[PDB]
Design an enzyme around this catalytic site. Structure first.
Site, short mmCIF file in Angstrom:
data_model
loop_
_atom_site.label_atom_id
_atom_site.label_comp_id
_atom_site.label_asym_id
_atom_site.label_seq_id
_atom_site.Cartn_x
_atom_site.Cartn_y
_atom_site.Cartn_z
N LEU A 127 0.73 -1.21 -0.13
CA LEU A 127 0.05 -0.01 -0.01
C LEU A 127 0.94 1.30 0.03
O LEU A 127 0.23 2.30 -0.67
CB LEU A 127 -1.01 0.20 1.32
N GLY A 128 2.08 1.09 0.51
CA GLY A 128 3.02 2.46 0.56
C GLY A 128 4.52 2.18 0.67
O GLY A 128 4.60 0.88 1.39
N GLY A 166 8.36 3.55 2.14
CA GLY A 166 8.99 4.80 3.08
C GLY A 166 10.64 4.38 3.02
O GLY A 166 11.03 3.34 2.62
N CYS A 167 11.19 5.51 3.90
CA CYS A 167 12.56 5.15 4.13
C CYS A 167 12.77 3.98 5.20
O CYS A 167 13.91 3.58 5.18
CB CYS A 167 13.19 6.39 4.56
N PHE A 168 11.82 3.82 6.07
CA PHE A 168 12.11 2.91 7.11
C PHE A 168 11.25 1.57 6.76
O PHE A 168 11.38 0.54 7.64
CB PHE A 168 11.60 3.68 8.43
N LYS A 212 2.71 -3.05 9.05
CA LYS A 212 3.79 -2.07 8.92
C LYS A 212 5.04 -3.01 8.97
O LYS A 212 5.07 -3.54 10.13
CB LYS A 212 3.75 -0.94 9.87
N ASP A 263 0.28 15.72 14.76
CA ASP A 263 0.31 15.66 13.25
C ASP A 263 -1.11 15.29 12.81
O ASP A 263 -1.48 14.53 12.07
CB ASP A 263 1.04 14.41 12.83
C1 LIG Z 1 3.20 12.44 20.59
C2 LIG Z 1 3.21 11.54 19.14
N1 LIG Z 1 2.03 10.98 19.15
C3 LIG Z 1 2.20 9.81 20.05
C4 LIG Z 1 1.10 9.03 19.84
N2 LIG Z 1 0.32 8.96 18.53
C5 LIG Z 1 -0.45 7.98 18.38
C6 LIG Z 1 -0.31 6.76 17.32
C7 LIG Z 1 0.73 6.49 17.20
C8 LIG Z 1 1.11 5.46 16.23
C9 LIG Z 1 -0.36 4.98 15.53
N3 LIG Z 1 -0.35 3.97 14.29
C10 LIG Z 1 -0.83 4.09 12.99
O1 LIG Z 1 -1.53 5.21 12.76
C11 LIG Z 1 -0.85 2.83 11.98
C12 LIG Z 1 -0.23 1.72 12.34
C13 LIG Z 1 -0.22 0.56 11.39
C14 LIG Z 1 -0.54 0.71 10.11
C15 LIG Z 1 -0.41 -0.46 9.18
C16 LIG Z 1 -1.11 2.18 9.83
O2 LIG Z 1 -1.57 2.28 8.51
C17 LIG Z 1 -2.81 1.75 8.21
N4 LIG Z 1 -3.34 1.10 9.12
C18 LIG Z 1 -4.74 0.51 8.85
N5 LIG Z 1 -5.05 0.76 7.60
C19 LIG Z 1 -4.79 1.51 6.54
C20 LIG Z 1 -4.93 1.42 5.18
C21 LIG Z 1 -4.49 2.01 4.27
O3 LIG Z 1 -4.91 2.15 2.78
C22 LIG Z 1 -5.65 1.24 2.46
C23 LIG Z 1 -3.13 2.72 4.31
O4 LIG Z 1 -2.31 3.10 3.67
C24 LIG Z 1 -0.79 3.12 3.58
C25 LIG Z 1 -2.31 2.33 5.70
C26 LIG Z 1 -3.10 1.85 6.71
C27 LIG Z 1 -1.19 3.25 10.86
C28 LIG Z 1 -1.54 5.68 15.77
C29 LIG Z 1 -1.54 6.51 16.60
C30 LIG Z 1 -2.97 7.27 16.95
F1 LIG Z 1 -2.76 8.58 16.93
F2 LIG Z 1 -3.75 6.69 16.18
F3 LIG Z 1 -3.47 7.11 18.07
C31 LIG Z 1 0.56 9.96 17.79
C32 LIG Z 1 1.61 10.76 17.96
#
Ligand SMILES: CCN1CCN(Cc2ccc(NC(=O)c3ccc(C)c(Oc4ncnc5cc(OC)c(OC)cc45)c3)cc2C(F)(F)F)CC1
Length: 386
Positions: free
Chosen positions: A130-131, A133-135, A152, A243
């Site tokens: 789906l995507g 990145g660098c990491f 991920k 963000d």
């Molecule tokens: C101070 C800093 N602070 C700390 C706390 N921090 C909270 C935090 C930290 C980490 C995450 N983790 C994720 O967001 C995540 C995890 C795993 C995956 C695979 C993911 O990507 C997709 N997941 C599911 N379906 C997807 C569908 C897609 O297309 C179809 C797609 O396209 C690429 C991607 C999809 C996204 C969420 C939060 C939250 F804000 F939510 F609480 C916020 C910042």
């Protein structure tokens, strides 16, 4: 407690009407799945939502009104709600269907070994990238062939296993139906972070797609209330997003929005997420862009910018202004005007989230309640006689 109504499997607290429908119509719920929720009239009034089936409506949810003993129809009344639920779980006496099972959001079963999230890599099958990145990449895959997930991955040599899994550690603590749900992990290289799958992807892409362009105003406000509901949870947990933007919102089925985040390697300090260390200019509050004061009040400024993306179906914030002009104009008190098609009441909430004093900005608890009761008008003034 143990005997209170809150401890029951079918009690869902104070969740929205739309949220009750989304969770009831989620997979794993049989016909007749139900839940008890608090209505919008008072705090002592309740509602019963049941999953029903018609051949015209298909799979839908019917909502019954519980009021005051407690009763749904005037014929049969009960002492408590738990006795009302017990009665209609045993006798289909006027309801659309016999109450079968409580509403359950079916998350798959892990190994159960103590990292309760560790699963064998054999159970995950990566299907489509789906995507990138660098990491690492983000994949669409399946867990045990049935349920769709998003994984991920960690490209070896680009990031330590602890710094990568710190995202999973944070997601274990932040568990809410309006935040992306962590499903499981794979702690051996290559590292996996398995989560729920939001089929429509980014909210920004969803709004600019043909389906999102046909979205009505009540639908956009409901999605806004869900985002505010998710941030209200982070507000209670003393976390901040840093963000918050439409590109970081994931959209699922029936306009189910969830909070997400990508590119967390910039926020790593000591295998932890420090938000004050060095961002998108047009979404971060001015006190965070100039003095690094990242708080939950700066996410409220971000949510106000997110509202402009929703109400315009994916328009860039501050049109025609470069990244330097916005920061100068914002500190001069300037903010975006009322967007085209945005009501006056909603634009008032946006202006409140853009007050230069961060302590005077609304809380996410108010924003959720405001957007959730945005179309429920006020009751007329009537004199109650003692
Ligand atoms: C101070 C800093 N602070 C700390 C706390 N921090 C909270 C935090 C930290 C980490 C995450 N983790 C994720 O967001 C995540 C995890 C795993 C995956 C695979 C993911 O990507 C997709 N997941 C599911 N379906 C997807 C569908 C897609 O297309 C179809 C797609 O396209 C690429 C991607 C999809 C996204 C969420 C939060 C939250 F804000 F939510 F609480 C916020 C910042």
């Amino acid at each position: 407690p143990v005997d209170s109504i809150q401890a029951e499997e079918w009690y869902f607290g104070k969740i929205g009407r739309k949220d009750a429908e989304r969770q009831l119509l989620s997979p794993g719920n049989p016909q007749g799945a139900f839940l008890i929720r608090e209505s919008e009239t008072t705090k002592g009034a309740y509602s019963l939502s049941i999953r029903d089936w018609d051949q015209t409506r298909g799979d839908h949810v019917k909502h019954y009104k519980i009021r005051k003993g407690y009763y749904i129809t005037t014929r049969v009344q009960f002492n408590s709600v738990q006795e009302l639920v017990q009665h209609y779980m045993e006798v289909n006496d006027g309801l659309c269907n016999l109450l079968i099972a409580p509403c359950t959001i079916m998350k798959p079963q892990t190994l159960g070994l103590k990292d309760a999230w560790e699963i064998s890599r054999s159970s995950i099958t990566l299907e489509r990238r789906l995507g990138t990145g660098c990491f690492g990449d983000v994949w669409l895959g399946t867990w045990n062939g049935s349920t769709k997930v998003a994984v991920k991955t960690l490209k070896p040599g680009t990031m330590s296993p602890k710094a990568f899994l710190e995202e999973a550690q944070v997601m274990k603590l932040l568990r809410h139906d309006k935040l992306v749900q962590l499903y499981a992990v794979v702690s051996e290289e290559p590292i996996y972070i398995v989560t729920e799958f939001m089929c429509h992807g980014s909210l920004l892409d969803f709004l600019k797609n043909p389906e999102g362009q046909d979205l009505r105003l009540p639908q956009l406000v409901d999605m806004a209330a869900q985002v505010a509901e998710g941030m209200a949870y982070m507000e209670r947990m003393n976390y901040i997003h840093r963000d918050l933007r439409a590109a970081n919102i994931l959209v699922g089925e029936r306009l189910a929005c969830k909070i997400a985040d990508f590119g967390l390697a910039r926020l790593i300090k000591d295998d932890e997420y420090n938000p004050c260390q060095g961002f998108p200019i047009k979404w971060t509050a001015p006190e965070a862009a100039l003095f690094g004061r990242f708080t939950i009040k700066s996410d409220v400024w971000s949510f106000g910018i997110l509202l402009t993306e929703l109400i315009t179906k994916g328009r860039i914030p501050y049109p025609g202004m470069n990244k330097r002009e916005v920061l100068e104009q914002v500190e001069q008190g300037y903010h975006m005007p009322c967007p085209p098609g945005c009501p006056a009441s909603l634009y008032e909430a946006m202006e409140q989230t853009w007050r230069l004093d961060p302590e005077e900005r609304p809380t996410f608890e108010y924003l959720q309640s405001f957007l959730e009761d945005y179309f429920t008008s006020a009751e007329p003034q009537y004199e109650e006689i003692p």
